[PDB]
């Protein structure tokens with residue numbers, strides 16, 4: 001009886017106990033989310049507590065099998081997923097304090113109000129739709145001070161305690177700890193070090209820099225037309241004018257940046273209601289789409305047990321669209337579907353999640369997940385990509401067969417896509433680099449805010465409207481920061497998404513620009529995609545990516561391919577205009 005054999009037996013017992021307990025908890029959670037009542041909340045909480053206690057004791061047991069005596073990499077992966085210590089390395093008092101800090105930061109972020117209006121919906125409405133410089137500036141500064149000033153000391157203590165936990169687990173810092181979510185060891189030709197992630201993010205960002213610079217110059221010009229005196233044509237962009245509370249996405253800038261405002265966007269909602277479509281039809285069409293590439297039908301249970309429309313005033317439900325994998329062959333979608341194009345695309349996205357879940361359902365319990373934190377949402381996004389293309393809507397009868405394309409409408413659509421995708425990439429990289437640097441200890445508190453805005457100036461070309469000192473905590477003014485979430489996932493997922501789409505459209509023998517591509521009816525693309533989906537978390541994410549795209553590494557080139565018509569059109573628009581920005585300017 002070797003250690004590896006004992007560990008195999010332990011994992012056997014664990015899987016059988018865990019699948020049952022996880023199913024009971026997931027079903028309690030489903031009963032709540034589709035039927036909000038006190039009885040259902042208590043059942044959900046009790047089942048979740050039972051599951052957490054089970055995982056606690058099972059991790060304690062798992063730690064009694066030393067990994068260095070495990071040669072089988074699958075057994076090692078599962079044991080490792082169980083043996084994570086985390087905050088438990090801290091003393092009882094230090095963990096108590098850290099959890100109090102985390103709870104406090106979350107509560108003040110969620111209950112914060114400026115006098116009084118609360119972030120959702122008031123200030124969000126202002127930052128999305130207001131065209132008054134003073135109103136927007138006020139809301140921006142108000143949140144930064146009213147909330148950030150509170151969060152600052154809490155965040156300093158949070159940094160100290162999180163770095164203590166990370167070094168107690170043998171990481172260099174909390175940032176190194178998070179970079180662990182991309183690490184791979186023991187598999188020659190597929191290993192990936194925690195440092196490699198930074199190097200590769202910075203490499204792909206070096207390649208994204210020209211497209212972002214030209215989008216920046218375009219948006220700066222258009223915003224100047226919208227804000228006469230307030231913007232310099234060689235300087236950075238005021239943070240309170242970027243379409244949301246942080247400039248995370250530039251989506252709401254469309255009104256001010258649409259290249260051809262007289263050319264409407266394609267919106268088949270009217271066609272969906274005129275053909276008398278219902279949620280059943282929408283989900284059946286998504287299912288047909290997936291069947292078209294050789295993936296299986298949704299289970300009978302899926303149709304029997306899902307919630308695909310709002311149950312109305314009879315009972316309240318959590319209407320956020322979500323895909324559920326309860327285990328034991330039970331797959332569902334929760335969605336308060338309305339007959340609208342957005343809901344058609346979101347249905348495709350979530351059923352893409354379900355297809356992923358079904359694909360890796362034969363893997364051990366602990367290996368049932370995306371290859372890494374970015375894989376699932378990329379799989380979801382590429383479905384909506386294929387569903388929205390005019391080729392596909394014609395194919396499924398939502399556009400008239402003679403519906404003529406138009407470069408102006410296509411460039412409009414591509415602009416919007418840029419404002420979101422390309423816009424958020426430098427934001428995300430800059431935010432996570434600031435956090436990495438704070439955790440690594442390269443930014444003393446005295447320069448915290450300074451470095452932040454310096455980086456905002458250099459990397460993303462955005463400047464603060466008001467001078468900010470070290471009493472604020474502007475990064476903590478965003479949910480992910482104040483609620484202790486990694487952020488680089490958005491960069492990596494966005495790049496993986498277009499890598500996937502390019503590889504699959506190639507397999508589908510698509511000709512022409514990448515954004516016009518529909519993978520429908522391609523069993524080649526379906527097979528390429530399934531060869532990855534079925535692995536779940538069992539193989540290195542480098543290999544999972546190779547199975548789809550033929551290369552083992554993250555690459556931004558497909559995103560540039562997707563945007564190349566817009567990149568060229570922008571370069572044409574900006575040829576007689578300054579591109580780039582000076583970090584010296586300030587409003």
Ligand SMILES: *[C@@H]1O[C@H](CO)[C@@H](O)[C@H](O)[C@H]1NC(C)=O
Pocket residue numbers: 035037039040315
């Ligand atoms: C919702 O929950 C309540 C309380 O548990 C229960 O009485 C009711 O039957 C549930 N509704 C449905 C549709 O199951």
Ligand SMILES: *[C@@H]1O[C@H](CO)[C@@H](O)[C@H](O)[C@H]1NC(C)=O
Pocket residue numbers: 008072073074075
């Ligand atoms: C690792 O162990 C699993 C059973 O736990 C087995 O299915 C698999 O073949 C083993 N891998 C190798 C390389 O022996």
Ligand SMILES: *[C@@H]1O[C@H](CO)[C@@H](O)[C@H](O)[C@H]1NC(C)=O
Pocket residue numbers: 063080083084085
């Ligand atoms: C969890 O803690 C034990 C010591 O208490 C340690 O030997 C083990 O390696 C830790 N887990 C991991 C994944 O390092």
Ligand SMILES: *[C@@H]1O[C@H](CO)[C@@H](O)[C@H](O)[C@H]1NC(C)=O
Pocket residue numbers: 291296297
């Ligand atoms: C998928 O389901 C449809 C009915 O919705 C059925 O006609 C078809 O044969 C099924 N195909 C597969 C491959 O499951």
Ligand SMILES: *[C@@H]1O[C@H](CO)[C@@H](O)[C@H](O)[C@H]1NC(C)=O
Pocket residue numbers: 292391392395396518520521
């Ligand atoms: C795929 O084939 C079906 C016939 O089964 C057809 O109705 C549909 O228009 C085709 N779509 C594409 C994009 O070729």
Ligand SMILES: *[C@@H]1O[C@H](CO)[C@@H](O)[C@H](O)[C@H]1NC(C)=O
Pocket residue numbers: 407408
């Ligand atoms: C649309 O694009 C084609 C190909 O680049 C070009 O020949 C045509 O002149 C363009 N038309 C408009 C209206 O932009």
Ligand SMILES: [Cl-]
Pocket residue numbers: 321322323
């Ligand atoms: Cl989601």
Ligand SMILES: [Cl-]
Pocket residue numbers: 022325326327328365368
């Ligand atoms: Cl599961």
Ligand SMILES: [Cl-]
Pocket residue numbers: 420421424494
């Ligand atoms: Cl995105």
Ligand SMILES: [Cl-]
Pocket residue numbers: 239246474475477
């Ligand atoms: Cl900010």
Ligand SMILES: [Cl-]
Pocket residue numbers: 374377489490493
């Ligand atoms: Cl994501």
Ligand SMILES: [Zn+2]
Pocket residue numbers: 349350353377380
């Ligand atoms: Zn999703």
